[PDB]
Amino acid sequence: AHKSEVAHRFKDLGEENFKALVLIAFAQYLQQCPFEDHVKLVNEVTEFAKTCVADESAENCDKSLHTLFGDKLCTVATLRETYGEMADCCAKQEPERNECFLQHKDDNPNLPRLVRPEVDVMCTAFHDNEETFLKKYLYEIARRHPYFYAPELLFFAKRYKAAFTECCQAADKAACLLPKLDELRDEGKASSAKQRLKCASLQKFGERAFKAWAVARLSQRFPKAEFAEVSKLVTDLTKVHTECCHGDLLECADDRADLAKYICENQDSISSKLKECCEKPLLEKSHCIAEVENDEMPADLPSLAADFVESKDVCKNYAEAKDVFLGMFLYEYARRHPDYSVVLLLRLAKTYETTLEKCCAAADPHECYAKVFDEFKPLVEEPQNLIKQNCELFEQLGEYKFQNALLVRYTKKVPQVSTPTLVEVSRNLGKVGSKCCKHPEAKRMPCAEDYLSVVLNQLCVLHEKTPVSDRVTKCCTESLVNRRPCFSALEVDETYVPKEFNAETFTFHADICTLSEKERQIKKQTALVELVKHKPKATKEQLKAVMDDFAAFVEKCCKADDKETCFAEEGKKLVAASQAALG
Ligand SMILES: CC[C@@](O)(C(=O)O)c1cc2n(c(=O)c1CO)Cc1cc3c(N)cccc3nc1-2
Ligand SMILES: CCCCCCCCCCCCCC(=O)O
Ligand SMILES: CCCCCCCCCCCCCC(=O)O
Ligand SMILES: CCCCCCCCCCCCCC(=O)O
Ligand SMILES: CCCCCCCCCCCCCC(=O)O
Ligand SMILES: CCCCCCCCCCCCCC(=O)O
Structure with missing residues (x-):
């Protein structure tokens, strides 16, 4: 490795991968450069690399990758003209220079x-x-x-x-x-x-919060690993995550490679499922390991009752190293529950923590905390019920109708959200149903957590830029542990003044017949949102009547002779009838 680092990278990665990564890397800094200029840089860099492969001692081959990359960046003639103050990075020495380039990524x-x-x-x-x-x-x-x-x-x-x-x-x-x-x-x-999101939550909630998440996730993945091994992995994963959030490609990659290397050298201490990943090229190892399915759980693990409720030194063990003891609890709980979302496990650990903090200061702690596991039961069943209810609803409705049920529900809870965001979110929420409900119950909650995190975060991003509801801001700014329950807790908005009727909003043309399935669905769902916004007191039942009238109306107007007029004509009367029925 150390000699000519570029030659070593070229040897490990291979020519094709090397060229592709160099292209990506330049493109991520020289974001305004034409594709041709990058191709030329990549070819120049690759030809140089080859000289170092032929001879590590060849001119400039002993320079660091950072030095070589930045030198090359600083040879772009139009650097100042195109990137302005980033060209000032070239006046710096190379630890500071790369940091300077890093900060000027847009x-x-x-x-x-x-x-x-x-x-x-x-x-x-x-x-x-x-x-x-x-x-x-x-x-x-x-x-x-x-x-x-x-x-x-x-x-x-x-x-x-x-x-x-x-x-x-x-x-x-x-x-x-x-x-x-x-x-x-x-x-x-x-x-x-x-x-x-992960990097934002790292800096907002701190390293301890991330470590807890990691203990839970790593314990689910590697339930056969000992706690001390999971804890080592949490430490390394935290450094990886922290340094990768900092954003330097090479620092992040080396961290990930080092972690992947350690994991692969210690498979017997970690998981029986890593053999294929650990045989893969260096480039793909960490990615592969990140996607590895949970190991099988050890057979006949005992209850957590003995160590965490019934032992005489719960409070003693807790107080001498609280996070370690809590980590142990979370490790034991997670390894037994690959069917839980990570955030649910964190709710359980937080609950346990609150109880130990309350109870261990009591005259008789054991009497105080003896039934703490009862407190977990409703926390566990809340997402389990929600999943059962939603998957059963999806199965009876199909995806499109499922999205419409969500659409009506969420429009009523937060009516000031823009129509297109309500449409997007509801549609995407329907997709997570379509996807995660195809899993047996054992895998539904982690699936939903993963995909809800995408959909809910997208919503929060849109809402950050264009805020309309304090309640949504609250949920979006809360812990990630409480993000989803916060949203689930959203109540119907009863302070909401109905949106004034707009004629064009409820006017349909024959173009509707030629739209793609998707185009048609979004057009129909858009109007459905607007219908709810105009008539928020309309029930699912009454809405279904207007929707069934509309559905008949479009089936009618799309097919029976020369026809943009019904769309205007039946449009007049569908609207009138709907207006009266919801009046
Ligand atoms: C190049 C492929 C494609 O053009 C397509 O047709 O799917 C395309 C691809 C992508 N995006 C797009 O908006 C479009 C076009 O909307 C956004 C986007 C984000 C990406 C990301 N963050 C990571 C990796 C690939 C991504 N690819 C795309
Ligand atoms: C000067 C040219 C620099 C080329 C950039 C090389 C990037 C190598 C990163 C690939 C290593 C991946 C390790 C991993 O994710 O597990
Ligand atoms: C060395 C192992 C570190 C483990 C850290 C303690 C875990 C305590 C769980 C408390 C839950 C907090 C979740 C959160 O803050 O988002
Ligand atoms: C609206 C689409 C529903 C998708 C399936 C139901 C998901 C309900 C929430 C599951 C819990 C996610 C993680 C958690 O909060 O513990
Ligand atoms: C703009 C309003 C956004 C809608 C609020 C998102 C709510 C998602 C909570 C998780 C979904 C659980 C299933 C359900 O809808 O009951
Ligand atoms: C107050 C004017 C009401 C006019 C009719 C509004 C129709 C709203 C969209 C109906 C969505 C139904 C989608 C479908 O079932 O295919």
């Missing part, structure tokens, strides 16, 4: 949004020049997400390439390709949002 570069070309256009461009087509994908995404972990982008790119490879040869290219591009896009946005 989280919002004001580039035009990415647009999806026609399927035939995409597949043709892919065919004409696969390498260019894919490298453009890397470039365009990376420079819009300068902190997105480069290797993970590589994994997105490889699936992006696989979508095109398969689907551009398919019979129905679009039917193959589009859902795959939609999934990558959604996963991409989600991953990027989750990354920022």
Whole structure:
């Protein structure tokens, strides 16, 4: 490794991966550079790397990656003209220089949004020049997400390439390709949002809160590992997470690689499921391990009662190292419950903590805390019930109707949220139902936690930028442990003044018949939100009557001879009848 670091990276990563990562890396700093300029830099950097591979002692090959990268950045002629004060980073020595470059990454570069070309256009461009087509994908995404972990982008790119490879040869290219591009896009946005969320919550709630989350998550994953091993892993994972949040690619990657290396050298102390991951290339190890399914739980683990309720030295053991004792509780509880969300486990540990804090100061602590496990039962059943109720509702409704039930519900709880956000959130909330309810009960809560975190965070981001409800701000600014229950606790808004009727809002044209399924659904759901906003006291029942009238009306107007007029004409009377029925 140490000698020529660039040659070592090139040897470990291989040429293709090396070139792709260098491209991503430059694109994340030189966010305004044309694709051609980056290609040229990458080629120059790769040709240099090859000289160091041929001879570690070759000129400049003993410089650090940071030194070489920044030197190269500082050779961009238009640096000052295009990036202004970032060019001032070049006047600094290289620990300070990289830090300076790091600070000048732009989280919002004001580039035009990415647009999806026609399927035939995409597949043709892919065919004409696969390498260019894919490298453009890397470039365009990376420079819009300068902190997105480069290797993970590589994994997105490889699936992006696989979508095109398969689907551009398919019979129905679009039917193959589009859902795959939609999934990558959604996963991409989600991953990027989750990354920022975790780093934001790290600095807001502190390292201890993160460690607790990690103990719970790591214990679920590796239930056979000893506590001391989970605790070591929590320490290392915290350093990784902290340094990766700081945002330097190489520092983050080396931390992750070091952790992945340790995990792979200690599989017998950690998990029986890591063998395949640990055989993979260095580049993919940590990513692979991050996605590993939970190990099987050890057979016939005893109750937690003995150590955490019935032992005579609960209070003594607690008081000598509270976080360690609480970590042990959380470790024991989590390893036995891969079916819980991490946040539920944290509710249990917080409950236990509050009880020990209250009870251990009592004259007779054991009498005080003896039934603490009763206190867990309603906390556990709340998400379990909510899941049962929602999955049962999804099954009876199907996804679209499920989204509409949510739409009506949430519009009534928080009517001042913009229509498109209510639509988006409700639609996405329906998708988590569609996805997570396909799991047996044992896996539903972690699924829902994962996907709810995406959907609820997206809502909070939108709400941060354009706030309308103190209640939503409260839930969004609360602990992540209480985020979801806070939202669940939202009550119908009874102070809400109905939105004035707008004619155009409830006016429909024959274009509605030719819209895609999605386009039609969003148009219908948009009106449904507006209907609730105009008539918040309308019941599910009364709404269903208007909705059934509307549904008949569109089925009618879309198919029976020369017809934009019914849409106007029946539109007049559907509206009138609805207005009276909800009047
Ligand atoms: C290049 C693929 C595509 O053009 C597509 O058609 O799906 C596309 C891809 C992506 N985005 C887009 O808005 C569009 C177009 O809306 C946002 C976005 C965020 C990403 C992220 N944070 C990480 C990784 C990949 C991402 N990809 C996309
Ligand atoms: C000067 C060119 C710099 C090229 C950037 C190389 C980036 C290497 C990161 C890949 C290591 C991944 C480790 C991991 O995530 O487990
Ligand atoms: C060395 C192991 C560190 C474990 C830290 C103690 C865990 C206590 C759980 C309390 C729950 C807090 C959750 C939170 O703050 O978001
Ligand atoms: C509206 C879509 C519902 C999706 C499935 C129901 C999920 C209910 C909340 C589950 C708990 C998430 C994690 C937690 O708070 O403990
Ligand atoms: C703009 C209003 C946002 C809607 C509030 C989000 C509520 C999500 C809570 C988790 C969903 C649980 C299932 C349910 O709806 O009962
Ligand atoms: C007060 C004017 C009411 C006009 C009719 C409003 C229709 C709202 C959208 C109906 C959504 C139904 C969606 C569906 O079931 O396919």
